[PDB]
Point group: C3
Chain length 417, copies 3
């Protein structure tokens, strides 16, 4: 209509229960037909808002977003643990108060070019960059995980070829806020982001949660609750500059909590990070001039039977924080390492907390390491020979810092005696 | 029908007189329509209930026992009823307004059995955990405080037996966002919470503001404006693991700013904390392996006459930060201690900033203490860190001079902040 | 009636042509209906005014003088008008779009006091303080910048005398959330603010972005994306106590990222700050007992041709962080100083990172300074130039002064924030520990 406000349950001839994808695409075509002129009375393409009331909507056609200033909004993030439910014996399901996620719920009924499996694809090349698209307070549900030859129960594989939101083109000032994502192989994949905000979402039981790909700048990932799968990323970024990752509560069971490849001049600060495996925070492939500060790291063991034996393939020598790059700053972090001598790998090894594998000029200061066998000896800081000219202060006793003293500046944490 | 309701458009009841009845009636309708749990891969998606801006009396407790219910308004609606109730009554007619507003739920319940005085009770037993209930951008107002047997003027007691939102049952993925709470004995009490987010609320002039009880995991309390009363909690958690408390601006006048009982592996980081009393951040009953980092602490004196002599009963030896527990990390905090030296209790005591009362392996590093003597500004001698004999094997670095760090050097690792000069 | 209004469903006027008249008409309706302050424990609950997505010209200033008014939209609607106005004009017809969108308020007011040029003016005297006004998820667009005799092209001056939101009176519990501001000389100016939250906004290509004026207490500026102009402020506060500034991503090209005058007992913590000039964080005029912690600072050279020679007037001896006041705490920050040695001013100077110009008892600990001699050249293409320079870590070392303590400042403590040669300070009167070196 003329005021650019649409409701998927009030779309003529549309059935969002059967195919909300088709309904939303039809609405987008309606907006474009009405907003053809870019420069009439200092305006002309203001965009629109599409509302999803709470409900169960099947999406059978991918939505293509190629207009700036489109807002898609609902009235509920709608999360429930499909992982827990699919591991309750089927005979006990009738007594459960509910089974499925809810809220403003988009069920992704697409086949498994991973962009083709995305419920929402945002794509538009040329100039200017597509700008200020907003996704807010709805639920995207991939419904089931499926057999992938890995031997585990189908619903525990984290594999289905489905993506919640995939942004393929260079973008500016995008927002993803208050969402729920559940049971998607990839929740949110955003290429070439500038000044993006991913804020206050619930992104859990997805193979990978947040991936920022290609390159980007001046973006932020804040105040999210995030839990991924053992082959996937919780928070991943590549070739980003000026990224701020803060105030997230990241829980298991991603391969990692935060994974950077070629990320520079960024900050991973004040997050609560919980993993069941090593390699929680990975700065790789010349990830340089980053601040990693005041994070709470907990690494312990998977308590839940269905995922006992499942891990990310990495041993305890990896480090909880691993750095390959120059001139980083690792300051004021807390590391709690809770492992059984029996489950340490390789057998007889001493776990590593912070590992510098390559690069120069890294400043590691004022980090507290707490290790328990449920104390347990750990290496607080391991500087490999291929990393040098680092500065390591008050981040472990002399024994806990493994490093060439001739080419690294080391001040051991004073000991009790 | 499309699961969206407006409390002013529901044909049963009157939200001005009893919005409780209206919302309960709406919830009954949702349940009547959403009876089947597995139809076409769904069946119980929940609903949204909208409160337009307005004054709504609640006389019946709302019982929320369904997942995916959102209750939303269009205004947090805060104004200081504390200030207004202390303005002389003859001046009230000249004030532009008296009461809070926005999408306002007036809690007209009798006092509690704490949960019986709750405007919103979230309770459901069995399985699975009730999940993804959302409260957004409305106002809950307990209207008046009343006599508590002692003592001061009724409107300054912080007592009425009323709760804004009480969550009794184990819950997952709940959200409380953009709310206003005012004049409630308890604003928000959530038991047995997993992956909860309490985000960007205004929770003030309530006896206690945020209480996380029983136990919980992986939750967060972020970006809130919080002010409590002198016998209550600003932020309280018990038996939580993996709690993140960050970016809050906590102002007076709670008994404390953050109080943990048996909280482990959690983070109280990057908050601004202002109190009028000692005992601002309390880690108690084996609160262990927590990070307390880069907070700004200010302790000064109550300036406002109606509360001038009212306090939390704790003396200046208590500490602004008190820790009873193991293996915590206290890093990069600023402490401003602003007191009248003549009013320090006990008489002749040197005030304490960080106190370790019990536990081992606490790491305290790179904290700045600034202390001043001001009448209710000269530099004031303080004990930056006090380690009691019952706490040992701690590491204290660059958090005070040798005189400022009171601790047994034989069983703790102490590095005094370097002195000026050569 | 139910206190909910939609600007496109109002009987009088035309929000396309003058939304200000429409909104003022709505406010008069609210007041007419809400005249009594104490009827059944209520009576003035306020209202909500909704702006669907659309282009709305504002020709009459909106005056908000009631508590509990919410003005909300359905899109922050930002696009870079700066990029567009530096694309050759003959190419504009071929661009997918030109203007900002979302729920868009176009400020068509003449230049102001500056309050007269505000699209929204919040003002009320008497008691109590106006309270709990909310602005949410709409766009305020000042359309054009104009010539001001500064040499620059008119659209690059950052001058138009327009303000998005101006709050003139003492206020309590205000919120500004999810907004988009673009092409305004001043985005958001709030006087005398108590318990204010400015949260999750996009405030960019404005001369100044956030200014907290007069005085204030217990406020917070959190989770914003902010970019100002070379004569203006990104985040500014004066005579505030207990301000929390955190989780902001501040990018160029403000004169500064954070500027305090007489601000005390406040926290500037966990922000990402990127500037093209010195003087990124300024604590001035007895700014005391503040925590400046775990921020990521980047200072480098403007790479975009339209602004390549434009700057904030300050030289490299200024400092990235400058402090005039007592008893502050500077802990755990990262500083990247990424400049061309030939472009340092004055010629042959050693750049200063942290400068203590006056005051006593400042505690500076555990700060990492990384300094590189790089030549970022420039390019006509904005986002290309911007991303390439952020990712370019290929360089030789650059000598810097990590901490400079002027003679006017003393009794400070400087720990692990630089080697001895990097800390220029009187050792007799300050406590200095050099970062260990090899
Ligand atoms: O490990 C987190 C990972 O597992 C999922 C289910 O696949 O959540 C499980 C869950 O329970 C674990 O945590 C609680 C600790 O409170 C413990 O009692 C239980 O034994 C664990 O399995 O994890 C969260 C808390 O992190 C709980 O709410 C949930 O029941 C999945 O959602 C998540 O990605
Ligand atoms: O002290 C906080 C506590 O008191 C209440 C009223 O019960 O608010 C009072 C208030 O005023 C104090 O701070 C102002 C501004 O610095 C000062 O001028 C006044 O003398 C003080 O009493 O506190 C907030 C700021 O913390 C002000 O907005 C407010 O007027 C209550 O709301 C709060 O929980």
């Amino acid at each position: 209509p003329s005021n650019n406000r649409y409701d998927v349950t009030e779309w003529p001839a549309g059935n969002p229960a059967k195919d909300i994808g088709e309904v939303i695409n039809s609405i987008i075509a309606d907006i474009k037909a009405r907003q053809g002129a870019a420069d009439v009375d200092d305006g002309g393409k203001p965009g629109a808002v599409i509302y999803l009331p709470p409900g169960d909507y099947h999406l059978r056609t991918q939505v293509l977003i190629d207009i700036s200033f489109l807002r898609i909004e609902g009235s509920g993030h709608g999360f429930t643990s499909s992982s827990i439910r699919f591991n309750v014996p089927e005979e006990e399901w009738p007594d459960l108060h509910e089974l499925w996620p809810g809220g403003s719920r988009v069920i992704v009924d697409l086949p498994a070019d991973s962009a083709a499996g995305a419920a929402f694809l945002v794509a538009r090349e040329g100039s200017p960059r597509i700008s200020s698209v907003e996704f807010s307070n709805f639920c995207i549900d991939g419904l089931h995980f499926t057999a992938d030859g890995s031997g585990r129960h189908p619903e525990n594989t984290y594999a289905n070829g489905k993506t919640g939101i995939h942004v393929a083109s260079a973008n500016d000032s995008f927002r993803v806020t208050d969402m729920g994502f559940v049971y998607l192989e990839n929740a949110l994949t955003i290429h070439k982001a500038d000044a993006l905000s991913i804020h206050h979402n619930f992104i859990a039981e997805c193979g990978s949660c947040i991936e920022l790909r290609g390159w980007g700048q001046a973006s932020k990932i804040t105040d999210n609750l995030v839990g991924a799968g053992p082959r996937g990323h919780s928070i991943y970024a590549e070739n980003h500059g000026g990224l701020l990752v803060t105030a997230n509560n990241v829980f298991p069971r991603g391969a990692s909590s935060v994974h950077f490849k070629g990320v520079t001049r960024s900050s991973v600060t004040n997050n609560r990070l919980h993993a069941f495996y090593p390699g929680m925070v990975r700065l790789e492939e010349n990830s340089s001039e980053n601040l990693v500060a005041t994070n709470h790291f907990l690494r312990d063991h998977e308590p839940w039977t269905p995922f006992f034996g499942v891990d990310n393939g990495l041993d305890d020598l990896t480090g909880l924080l691993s750095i390959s790059g120059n001139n980083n700053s690792v300051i004021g972090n807390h590391f709690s390492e809770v492992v059984d001598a029996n489950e340490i790998r390789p057998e007889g090894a001493t776990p590593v907390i912070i590992r510098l594998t390559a690069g120069t000029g890294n400043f590691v200061s004022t980090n507290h390491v707490v290790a328990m066998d449920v104390d347990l000896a750990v290496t607080a800081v391991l500087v490999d020979p291929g990393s040098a000219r680092n500065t390591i202060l008050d981040s472990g006793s002399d024994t806990q810092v493994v490093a060439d003293r001739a080419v690294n500046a080391i001040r051991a944490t004073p000991t009790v005696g």
